[PDB]
Amino acid sequence: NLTDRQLAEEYLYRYGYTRVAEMRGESKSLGPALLLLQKQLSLPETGELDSATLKAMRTPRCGVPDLGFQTFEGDLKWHHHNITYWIQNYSEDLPRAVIDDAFARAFALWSAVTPLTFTRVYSRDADIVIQFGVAEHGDGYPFDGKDGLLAHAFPPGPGIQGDAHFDDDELWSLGKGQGYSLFLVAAHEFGHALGLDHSSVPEALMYPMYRFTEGPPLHKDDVNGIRHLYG
Ligand SMILES: CCc1cccc2c(C(=O)N3CCc4ocnc4C3)[nH]nc12
Ligand SMILES: [Ca+2]
Ligand SMILES: [Ca+2]
Ligand SMILES: [Ca+2]
Ligand SMILES: [Zn+2]
Ligand SMILES: [Zn+2]
């Protein structure tokens, strides 16, 4: 129950737009930050809090910032071919075998277009630790309750780097009837865990907003992104 104006100020802060406007001497009023967001999300570039921009801001999305103060270790790509993953805990929203299969299908999408392989393990030292969490869940990037941000993930590297977390204040499903597709959100978050950033192409898997589809989720932009990372 923020005003539209308050939601806009919070969205622009959280995803990195306000900080870039400050570095350009232009954080006194909303217009410059709105133009940065419109370019980054491929909306019409009006510099106004218009209907398209407010609808974009109310849309469920990824919790990773779009522009950006979090320093990580190393060059943010994996340096071995066999990437391991551990499912640390489970949402009660789905059967464990359906959760396991949703993540395995999300890895299979990336496996075909990268020289990496993805193997399930049962170990704390897996490259990609998968966790379900609510609000403050042990990393100082707290979730926000139902809707808004759905999940986040860290770029390749040691410890927390490469891990994927899902907001369990969300209802997880396969995206049909009620709830968010765990398969589609996992495929997006696993992109980050391989070293990809957000796309500006609205049809691309790596676009930040949640879009349900029954079609093949990869687009040219995603496949080309991976190609420009891993020889
Ligand atoms: C939400 C976790 C988080 C907080 C701040 C920055 C984050 C990033 C991030 O910096 N990037 C997204 C992944 C990436 O690959 C190459 N560069 C990047 C940049 N990923 N997860 C992040
Ligand atoms: Ca890790
Ligand atoms: Ca949420
Ligand atoms: Ca839940
Ligand atoms: Zn994302
Ligand atoms: Zn987290």
**Dihedral of the alpha carbons of 201, 207, 211, 214, in degrees to the nearest 10:** 80
| Max Cα–Cα distance, the chain, nearest Å | 52
Domain with CATH 3.40.390.10 in the chain: 82-227
Residues touching ligand 1 (Cβ under 6 Å) are 63-65, 70, 76, 141, 152, 154-155, 192, 195, 197
Q: Whose CA is nearest to atom 21 of ligand 1?
A: 154
Reported resolution, Å: 1.7
Residue 195 marked as a ligand binder: no
197 assigned to a ligand binding site? no
Residue type, 69: F
Token output for 3: 């005003």
- Experimental technique used to determine this entry: X-ray
- The Å distance, Cα 76 to ligand 6 centre, comes to 18
**48, 189, 203, 214: the active-site residue:** 189
Question: Alpha-carbon distance 185 to 115, whole Å?
Answer: 22
- To the query of whether residue 189 is one of the catalytic residues in this protein, the response is yes
Q: Which of 204, 167, 200 is nearest to 187 (CA)?
A: 204
Task: Tokens 């977390």: give the residue.
Answer: 165
Ligand 1 closest atom vs CA 63: 1
Closest CA to 113 of 192, 1, 36, 222: 222
| Residues of the chain by 3-state class (helix, strand, coil), percent to 5 | 30, 15, 55
Residue 61 DSSP class: B
Q: Ligand 2: distance of its center to the CA of 77 in Å?
A: 12
CATH number of 82-227: 3.40.390.10
